[PDB]
Enzyme design. Structure first.
Site, PDB file in Angstrom:
ATOM      1  N   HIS A 182       0.859  -1.178   0.000  1.00 61.50           N
ATOM      2  CA  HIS A 182       0.000   0.000   0.000  1.00 61.50           C
ATOM      3  C   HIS A 182       0.909   1.247   0.000  1.00 61.50           C
ATOM      4  O   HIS A 182       2.050   1.259   0.490  1.00 61.50           O
ATOM      5  CB  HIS A 182      -0.786  -0.077   1.364  1.00 61.50           C
ATOM      6  N   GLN A 216      -4.125  -4.798   7.566  1.00 60.20           N
ATOM      7  CA  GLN A 216      -5.165  -5.751   7.079  1.00 60.20           C
ATOM      8  C   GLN A 216      -5.081  -7.099   7.797  1.00 60.20           C
ATOM      9  O   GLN A 216      -6.050  -7.863   7.787  1.00 60.20           O
ATOM     10  CB  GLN A 216      -5.000  -5.884   5.532  1.00 60.20           C
ATOM     11  N   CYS A 223      -5.149   2.396  -3.226  1.00 63.13           N
ATOM     12  CA  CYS A 223      -3.880   2.914  -2.690  1.00 63.13           C
ATOM     13  C   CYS A 223      -2.718   1.966  -3.059  1.00 63.13           C
ATOM     14  O   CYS A 223      -1.742   1.817  -2.244  1.00 63.13           O
ATOM     15  CB  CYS A 223      -3.869   3.117  -1.151  1.00 63.13           C
TER      16      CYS A 223
HETATM   17  C1  LIG Z   1     -10.102   3.431   1.784  1.00 61.99           C
HETATM   18  C2  LIG Z   1      -9.096   2.267   2.069  1.00 61.99           C
HETATM   19  C3  LIG Z   1      -7.984   2.264   2.937  1.00 61.99           C
HETATM   20  C4  LIG Z   1      -7.445   0.969   2.857  1.00 61.99           C
HETATM   21  N1  LIG Z   1      -6.315   0.457   3.463  1.00 61.99           N
HETATM   22  C5  LIG Z   1      -5.785   0.749   4.860  1.00 61.99           C
HETATM   23  C6  LIG Z   1      -4.352   0.247   4.853  1.00 61.99           C
HETATM   24  C7  LIG Z   1      -3.268   1.019   5.214  1.00 61.99           C
HETATM   25  C8  LIG Z   1      -3.378   2.483   5.620  1.00 61.99           C
HETATM   26  O1  LIG Z   1      -4.087   2.414   6.935  1.00 61.99           O
HETATM   27  P1  LIG Z   1      -4.793   3.837   7.445  1.00 61.99           P
HETATM   28  O2  LIG Z   1      -3.605   4.783   7.885  1.00 61.99           O
HETATM   29  O3  LIG Z   1      -5.684   3.376   8.590  1.00 61.99           O
HETATM   30  O4  LIG Z   1      -5.525   4.441   6.259  1.00 61.99           O
HETATM   31  C9  LIG Z   1      -1.969   0.526   5.185  1.00 61.99           C
HETATM   32  N2  LIG Z   1      -1.765  -0.828   4.756  1.00 61.99           N
HETATM   33  C10 LIG Z   1      -2.792  -1.606   4.443  1.00 61.99           C
HETATM   34  C11 LIG Z   1      -2.468  -3.053   4.073  1.00 61.99           C
HETATM   35  C12 LIG Z   1      -4.083  -1.081   4.471  1.00 61.99           C
HETATM   36  O5  LIG Z   1      -5.155  -1.924   4.249  1.00 61.99           O
HETATM   37  C13 LIG Z   1      -8.207   0.245   1.955  1.00 61.99           C
HETATM   38  O6  LIG Z   1      -7.961  -0.934   1.636  1.00 61.99           O
HETATM   39  O7  LIG Z   1      -9.236   0.938   1.526  1.00 61.99           O
END
Ligand SMILES: CC1=C/C(=N\Cc2c(COP(=O)(O)O)cnc(C)c2O)C(=O)O1
Ligand SMILES: CC1=C/C(=N\Cc2c(COP(=O)(O)O)cnc(C)c2O)C(=O)O1
Lengths: 408, 408
Positions: free
Chosen positions: A123, A203, A363
């Site tokens: 991500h 995740q 992302c």
């Molecule tokens: C809108 C949206 C954010 C998402 N991902 C959050 C996320 C994040 C970022 O977490 P956040 O700072 O809570 O947005 C980092 N790594 C992984 C594997 C993630 O799933 C997603 O899948 O859809």
């Protein structure tokens, strides 16, 4: 033992409503999860009864709020099996936790010739802070390649990681492919080359047990909003010997011990990394989310999601003209495309039937380029979803296909 | 027009309880404020009905949550009279907002010979990020001196600020002295010397109207938890032309436009400065706190607090052996010491009578050294406090004095 999905869904008030005249079918828990009444009533009791700022040696409500906040820190330590509360830092979310490691660890420990190793499935939160840190230091960024089903082979890890590698950063579970990466074996390879491993657990944490002693990861980051807890809060775990030697990322009250006109000294861990008034209500609510998920059982949640993922992959293979990305063995999500229908339009027509999915790059633009598409649709699951909801999704995709063919 | 304090207190459920067998008297709103049911029920309706992640072009609940979050950004812009939503950034609190200015503006715009000018009355959140930024750049930190009643004279500002000054950072209102500093005239002096002015508005925003066009401040920072809103959220305001030229402080999803393997480009303001999933519920709750305070009237709240401060200063002058610090004209707080009783023990005995005050250095150790003490006690007020509560406080201080004299 065995979870009853009726009784779990009854605790989430938001699931019981219609959208566009159809029962809601919420299949977007990888973007954010829904909350049970145990967490929402935790926030209400905090603001109705004992809100106050936190600190040793204050009045009665301030002591209750401090015991609540530091109580929640111990629940987090037990939940990921860290050795000490000094290794559990509250932050605003996974993204801020990984930026703290890149600012305070990587910018202090990289020089020209050094490498940071990541993967094509990461991500953006686990790509951009490293791009910026190698730029600032003159180091090199390298990518581990993927196998054709979107898994990582340990041979490719050994090939990419070298004795010039100082940091390997990698997702525990991909939010697009559903792949569970072999973090424990990757940590061994990093350590044998002289590097630390930084794990993005946003995740994995909501959906399977985490034990950072067994994984032997040097840093681990997670977000409350994906695991039934309030928005605006997350954790950074780091091994105590590495945090002791890192400087703070932000400066202010609560993280100091002595402040002179020009120079200051810092508090011990973990408070050295928590500047200003903390996220009091949100951390107490994340502790209630942990208590809720532990009473159900993370292995029970993982087994439910294994059943839903196996059921969804079979039913998707019944649809003509649909591609699913990633491996057969996976976490509880499916990212896909219909032939000849843009994924934005898929998500538009599904929301008209009450069904919430997400379309876009999720992302992960380098991964979409690897997959040779510009965007995808994703249905993702959690403890309150059922096989009947997957039937609704595959029936709606069949009708979507027939609709666009009729249009054309 | 005129606020009815009975009807305001009826909306704060936490005020209606006993501590140690006495009605609660909460006089610690400068450490954090209490919340009305309008804000607590805002958070409940968000998690019960429309929680989802935020973005253009998604399903029905995701559109409601996005309209809620960006709706709250417009309420903040109107509340401090900024020209554009591009100038309003949501952060985790005042402390993070001032650290963003020190990381992204000062570390990019200071070199040897340049000066950052602050004051002896500043909170640590508006001291330590500047100590660290001048250290990183080789610049100089300088302090404006105080007058004997803890005010700043504009002559001393002109003397300290020079053509080598690049940043002046100053509190709007002190959380210890109660002084309201002459920010609009200080901004003129900074600009006439070629510098920007950074204003710490954590103690002013809850208690008086803010108009950043009339103040002409270049940056302004505030916290939700002090102004009837949720914990874990704050704002950084900056003039658009300065934010356009600053790099992000943190990197990840949502703040990008294109991500390649080694290089990325950023989104437009304000999203360039908001990385990751945002503080969705907390920002929507801060918008409800703004709506609540605007319906009462910030000038009405300021007039109530002028009445309580005048009443408290008179009644403190009735006590023998008590020192109050700071000026006669002030915001709604009193910091003091009893002769011969340590302020920690004052706050211990007051909490046994139901009365919540705070003792310590109040995150302003350089100011305590200026005052020649190591710690103080502070009672601070807000819209739900009354003259009868001040009578309780001064009667309890008289009894405390007699108690310790009897002990000795
Ligand atoms: C809108 C949206 C954010 C998402 N991902 C959050 C996320 C994040 C970022 O977490 P956040 O700072 O809570 O947005 C980092 N790594 C992984 C594997 C993630 O799933 C997603 O899948 O859809
Ligand atoms: C526990 C406590 C924090 C207090 N101050 C918050 C504060 C802050 C820090 O705001 P925070 O990041 O919300 O803790 C910065 N400047 C001023 C003038 C402040 O009042 C306080 O007076 O008591």
């Amino acid at each position: 033992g065995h979870m009853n999905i009726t009784d779990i869904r009854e605790q989430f008030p938001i699931l019981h409503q219609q959208v566009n005249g159809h029962d809601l079918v919420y299949l977007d828990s990888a973007a954010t999860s829904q909350k049970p009444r145990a967490v929402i009533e935790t926030l209400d009791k905090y603001y109705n009864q004992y809100n106050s700022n936190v600190h040793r040696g204050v009045h009665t409500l301030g002591t209750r709020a401090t015991d609540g906040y530091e109580g929640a820190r111990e629940k987090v330590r037990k939940f990921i099996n860290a050795k000490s509360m000094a290794e559990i830092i509250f932050t605003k979310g996974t993204t801020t936790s990984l930026n703290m490691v890149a600012l305070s660890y990587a910018r202090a420990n990289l020089k020209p010739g050094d490498e940071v190793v990541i993967t094509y499935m990461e991500h953006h939160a686990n790509i951009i802070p490293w791009q910026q840190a190698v730029k600032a230091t003159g180091a090199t960024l390298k990518y581990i390649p993927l196998q054709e089903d979107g898994t990582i082979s340990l041979e490719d890890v050994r090939e990419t990681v070298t004795s010039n590698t100082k940091i390997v950063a990698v997702s525990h579970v991909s939010n697009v492919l559903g792949t569970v990466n072999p973090i424990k074996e990757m940590a061994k390879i990093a350590h044998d080359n002289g590097a630390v491993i930084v794990v993005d657990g946003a995740q994995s944490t909501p959906h399977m047990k985490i034990d950072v002693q067994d994984l032997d990861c040097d840093f681990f980051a997670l977000s409350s909003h994906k695991m039934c807890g309030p928005t605006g809060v997350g954790v950074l775990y780091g091994k105590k010997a590495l945090l002791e030697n890192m400087e703070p990322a932000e400066f202010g009250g609560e993280m100091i011990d002595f402040v002179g006109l020009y120079e200051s000294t810092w508090k011990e861990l973990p408070w050295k990394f928590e500047a200003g008034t903390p996220i009091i209500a949100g951390a107490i609510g994340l502790g209630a989310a942990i208590d809720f998920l532990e009473e159900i059982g993370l292995d029970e949640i993982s087994r439910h999601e294994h059943k839903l993922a196996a059921y969804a992959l079979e039913r998707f293979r019944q649809l003509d003209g649909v591609t699913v990305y990633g491996p057969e063995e996976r976490a509880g999500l499916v990212t896909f495309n219909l032939d000849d229908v843009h994924p934005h339009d898929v998500a538009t027509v599904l929301d008209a039937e009450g069904i919430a999915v997400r379309a876009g790059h999720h992302c992960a633009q380098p991964l979409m380029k690897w997959l040779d598409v510009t965007a995808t649709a994703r249905a993702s699951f959690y403890l309150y979803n059922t096989e009947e909801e997957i039937d609704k999704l595959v029936e709606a995709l069949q009708k979507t296909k027939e609709y666009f063919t009729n249009v054309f």
